[PDB]
Structure formats: C-alpha cells, structure tokens
C-alpha cells in the first residue's frame, strides 16, 4: 500500500492546563500525489464541551506532505480522562495504517 496515513502512536498524554492537544498524523510511502482522510474526535471519559472541544474534518495531504499536527482544544474544569480520535474514509488513493485511531489522555498538573 502507498500513501499510508496513521496516527504516530495509539496514545498521547497531555496536561489539562495545556489548552491544546497536539496530535501527529503521518503519511508514509508517498506515491507522489494528494491524499485525503477524514478525522473525528469521539468522547471517552473525557467529554466534548466539558473536557475538550470536539472537532471533525478532512486532512488533505498535498504532494510531498509527510505529516500533520491536529490541534484539539482542551478545557479546564488525580483526575484522568480520555477521548479518542479516529481516521476514516481514505480518498485519492490513500490508505489507513496502524494505528488509525488514538487515545488522548488528559491528566492534572
């Protein structure tokens, strides 16, 4: 498979006070053209509009682009809560690699 798009890791840890989670998405084995995938957040024990600001959209990789950083806003309130981000719907010849979903762990300062 070419143009393989994945999260870099199955888990990321962030502090609740950071204001944003910075989530890396990579594209590997470039064939030379554009790629697109969809992404979306999904609640776990962390909930949209309480713990973080939910977001969904498309990641359009132009030719040569090997990575993106998603920025999901975090909200302030030994607490630990989790939300998820999923990739779906590859287009323009793209494929999903592993891991295609990830978990963002929000911890206290």
Curated annotation (Swiss-Prot):
Highest taxon in the source lineage: Eukaryota
Localization in the cell: Cell membrane; Cell junction, Hemidesmosome
Modifications made to the protein after synthesis: Palmitoylated by DHHC3 at several cysteines of the membrane-proximal region, enhancing stability and cell surface expression. Palmitoylation also promotes secondary association with tertaspanins.
Tissue: Integrin alpha-6/beta-4 is predominantly expressed by epithelia. Isoform beta-4D is also expressed in colon and placenta. Isoform beta-4E is also expressed in epidermis, lung, duodenum, heart, spleen and stomach.
Domain (Calx-beta) ranges: 2-88
Job description of the protein: Integrin alpha-6/beta-4 is a receptor for laminin. Plays a critical structural role in the hemidesmosome of epithelial cells. Is required for the regulation of keratinocyte polarity and motility. ITGA6:ITGB4 binds to NRG1 (via EGF domain) and this binding is essential for NRG1-ERBB signaling. ITGA6:ITGB4 binds to IGF1 and this binding is essential for IGF1 signaling. ITGA6:ITGB4 binds to IGF2 and this binding is essential for IGF2 signaling.
Subunit annotation: Heterodimer of an alpha and a beta subunit. Beta-4 associates with alpha-6. Interacts (via cytoplasmic region) with COL17A1 (via cytoplasmic region). Interacts (via cytoplasmic region) with DST isoform 3 (via N-terminus). Isoform beta-4a interacts (via cytoplasmic domain) with DST (via N-terminus). Interacts with RAC1. ITGA6:ITGB4 is found in a ternary complex with NRG1 and ERBB3. ITGA6:ITGB4 is found in a ternary complex with IGF1 and IGF1R. ITGA6:ITGB4 interacts with IGF2. Interacts with TMEM268; this interaction prevents ITGB4 degradation.
Family stated for the protein in its record: Belongs to the integrin beta chain family.
Annotated disorder: Epidermolysis bullosa, junctional 5A, intermediate: A form of epidermolysis bullosa, a genodermatosis characterized by recurrent blistering, fragility of the skin and mucosal epithelia, and erosions caused by minor mechanical trauma. JEB5A is an autosomal recessive, intermediate form in which blistering lesions occur between the epidermis and the dermis at the lamina lucida level of the basement membrane zone. Epidermolysis bullosa, junctional 5B, with pyloric atresia: A form of epidermolysis bullosa, a genodermatosis characterized by recurrent blistering, fragility of the skin and mucosal epithelia, and erosions caused by minor mechanical trauma. Junctional epidermolysis bullosa is characterized by blistering that occurs at the level of the lamina lucida in the skin basement membrane. JEB5B is an autosomal recessive, severe, frequently lethal form with variable involvement of skin, nails, mucosa, and with variable effects on the digestive system.
Domain note: The VWFA domain (or beta I domain) contains three cation-binding sites: the ligand-associated metal ion-binding site (LIMBS or SyMBS), the metal ion-dependent adhesion site (MIDAS), and the adjacent MIDAS site (ADMIDAS). This domain is also part of the ligand-binding site.
Designated name of the protein: Integrin beta-4
Gene behind this protein: ITGB4
